């Protein structure tokens, strides 16, 4: 892996359940057998959406957790674990959505202003999720929902391995900047979603708070605004994305815009920890979307990310570490293109996020954005997951592998692996002063024969005059590898004479000794 390390010893694979309730797909018995089959193939748990539109449909505080309980009961019967996603967003209307579960319709009547929803640069209203600006309503409803959920699921704490939170549209922490009705669907640029009267005044107040008076504002922005009412979000999103973002106004606007999501992250993190920490004692996380299109567009750089709320990922992630939430990213199966008209750079994106996450010490999890129907994609996922320290991978989605034996088998071999610590010992290595020894192998968890970025470093043993190290390996899988010497400058000086192999890697910790 990167930095001479190996795969994450805590790696676990998860399976995303269908969007529709199980009884609308098959029966519970078959479901239980499907789970036992999944477990046999390396899946640790099944993650599932529990829709707010289902749990508090009739009215405020009129809960119904019977479905969530019946689902959990079956997960228990199968001897599996589950990861519930408290989906406080709408199901249906997004790419791949085969459901129709809006959030409770009564929530919209709790405000007379337009503080609860979104409005784009061109007036398109969006109600897939509550506007994070309405922190008073979010604090009340999410607060009540989480606590009620914890109480109702207390009997099933032993099957709950983790809890995922929904931070916005499609359960991702972002603005609904790419939708069909707003004319911003992939791969178009996104539109900013801060044009409700409420959003405009919040921005205005934020600016005035930072500068004190319109006079200081004009001085800081180099503008000549005639009155406080002139403080507004961009009038032309495209012109803003072309060069307006470079100005002091631009920096302030984007800071406030992304700031709304960071504060939201801290709020739901606090509500979630207060409601689950004592009862479940399990990790909690949220998701960041992989808005990979228009990444390297020369005309409108990061033309889709910025409107979605992503302008400074490093700053964004600090909010996660601060809220004590793990992060889940997407598009781990795609590769870079960066060509007109999509200007898509998914891999470069995932690499940047993973790097930042690791620096800050944030537990990183991944998912694939689109269904995988070929072994080649699993390989790319494996490359990113095992060489960028991912702690988990969730496969979207259930049916893709449950009704395709060959694909399921390829997932088990490549991704449904159990990491096991092993000692590698290499003797008779002709190292000179300054040289270092590394190992690299055929599988992704071994760097796929890469000697530049992914090799696994070994450590000289002065007492036995050999090189060794504890490496995390995929249990019960065949591997081939070779040690090599790297000069003090970074060039590969030589390789081990004979290629080594372990067919397969034992599941009990032991050691593999070979000679140069
Ligand atoms: O199932 C996980 C997610 O998949 C996608 C759906 O659009 C989203 O609503 C759901 O939460
Ligand atoms: O906009 C939603 C979807 O659009 C396209 O299908 C992209 O390939 C995918 O990554 C994204 O999730
Ligand atoms: Ca409520």
UniProtKB/Swiss-Prot annotation:
GO terms for molecular function: beta-amylase activity; metal ion binding; starch binding. It comes from the Bacteria. GO terms for biological process: polysaccharide catabolic process. Residues 414-516 form the CBM20 domain. SMART domains: CBM_2. Disulfide bonds join 91-99. Pfam families: CBM_20, Glyco_hydro_14. Its EC number is 3.2.1.2. Substrate binds at residues 49, 89, 97, 287, 292, 330, 368-369, 397. Keywords: Calcium, Carbohydrate metabolism, Disulfide bond, Glycosidase, Hydrolase, Metal-binding, Polysaccharide degradation, Signal. Binds 1 Ca(2+) ion per subunit. The active site is at 172 (proton donor), 367 (proton acceptor). Its cofactor is Ca(2+). InterPro entries: CBM20, CBM20_beta_amylase, Glyco_hydro_14, Glyco_hydro_14_CS, Glyco_hydro_14A_bac, Glycoside_hydrolase_SF, Ig-like_fold. It is an enzyme of class 3 (hydrolase). Ca(2+) binds at residues 56, 60-61, 141, 144. It catalyses: Hydrolysis of (1->4)-alpha-D-glucosidic linkages in polysaccharides so as to remove successive maltose units from the non-reducing ends of the chains. SUPFAM superfamilies: (Trans)glycosidases. Monomer. PANTHER family: BETA-AMYLASE 1, CHLOROPLASTIC, BETA-AMYLASE 3, CHLOROPLASTIC. Belongs to the glycosyl hydrolase 14 family. This is Beta-amylase. It comes from Bacillus cereus. The gene is spoII.
């Amino acid at each position: 892996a990167v930095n001479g390390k190996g795969m994450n010893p805590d790696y676990k694979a998860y399976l995303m359940a269908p969007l529709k309730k199980i009884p609308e797909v098959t029966n519970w018995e078959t479901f239980e057998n499907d789970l036992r089959w999944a477990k046999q193939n390396g899946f640790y748990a099944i993650t599932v959406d529990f829709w707010w539109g289902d749990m508090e449909k009739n009215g405020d505080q009129q809960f119904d957790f019977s479905y969530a309980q019946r689902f959990a009961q079956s997960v228990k019967n199968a001897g599996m674990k589950m990861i519930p996603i408290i989906s406080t967003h709408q199901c249906g209307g997004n790419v791949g959505d085969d459901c129709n579960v809006p959030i409770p319709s009564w929530v919209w009547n709790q405000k007379s202003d337009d503080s609860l929803y979104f409005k784009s640069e061109t007036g398109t209203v969006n109600k897939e999720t509550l506007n994070p600006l309405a922190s008073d309503v979010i604090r009340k409803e999410y607060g009540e929902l989480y606590t009620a959920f914890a109480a109702a699921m207390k009997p099933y704490k032993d099957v709950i391995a983790k809890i995922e939170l929904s931070g916005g549209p499609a359960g991702e922490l972002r603005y609904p900047s790419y939708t069909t009705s707003d004319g911003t669907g992939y791969p178009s640029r996104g539109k900013f979603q801060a044009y409700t009267e409420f959003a405009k005044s919040k921005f205005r107040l934020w600016v005035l708070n930072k500068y004190g008076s319109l006079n200081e504002v004009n001085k800081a922005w180099g503008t000549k605004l005639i009155s406080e009412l002139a403080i507004l979000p961009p009038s032309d999103g495209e012109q803003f994305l072309m060069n307006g973002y470079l100005s002091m106004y631009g920096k302030d606007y984007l800071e406030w815009y992304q700031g709304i999501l960071e504060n939201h992250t801290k709020l739901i993190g606090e509500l979630a920890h207060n409601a689950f920490d004592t009862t479940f004692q399990v990790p909690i996380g949220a998701k960041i979307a992989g808005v990979h299109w228009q990444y390297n567009n020369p005309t409108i750089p990061h033309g889709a990310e910025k409107p979605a709320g992503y302008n400074d990922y490093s700053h964004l992630l600090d909010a996660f570490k601060s809220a004590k939430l793990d992060v889940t990213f997407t598009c781990l199966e795609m590769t870079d293109k960066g060509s007109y008209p999509e200007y898509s750079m998914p891999k470069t994106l995932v690499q940047n996020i993973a790097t930042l996450a690791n620096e800050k010490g944030i537990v990183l999890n991944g998912e694939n954005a689109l269904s995988i129907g070929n072994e080649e994609e699993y390989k790319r996922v494996a490359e990113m997951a095992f060489n960028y320290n991912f702690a988990g991978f969730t496969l979207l989605r259930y049916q893709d592998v449950m009704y395709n034996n060959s694909l399921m088998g390829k997932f088990k071999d490549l991704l449904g692996v159990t990491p096991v610590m092993q000692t590698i010992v290499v003797k008779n290595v002709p190292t000179t002063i300054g040289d270092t020894v590394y190992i690299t192998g055929n599988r992704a968890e071994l760097g796929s024969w890469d000697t530049k970025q992914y090799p696994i470093q070994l450590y000289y043993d002065s007492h036995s005059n050999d090189w060794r190290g504890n490496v995390v390996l995929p249990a019960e899988r065949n591997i081939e590898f070779k040690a090599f010497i790297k000069s003090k400058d970074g060039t590969v000086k030589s390789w081990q004479t004979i290629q080594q192999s372990w067919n397969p890697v034992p599941l009990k910790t032991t050691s593999h000794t070979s000679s140069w």
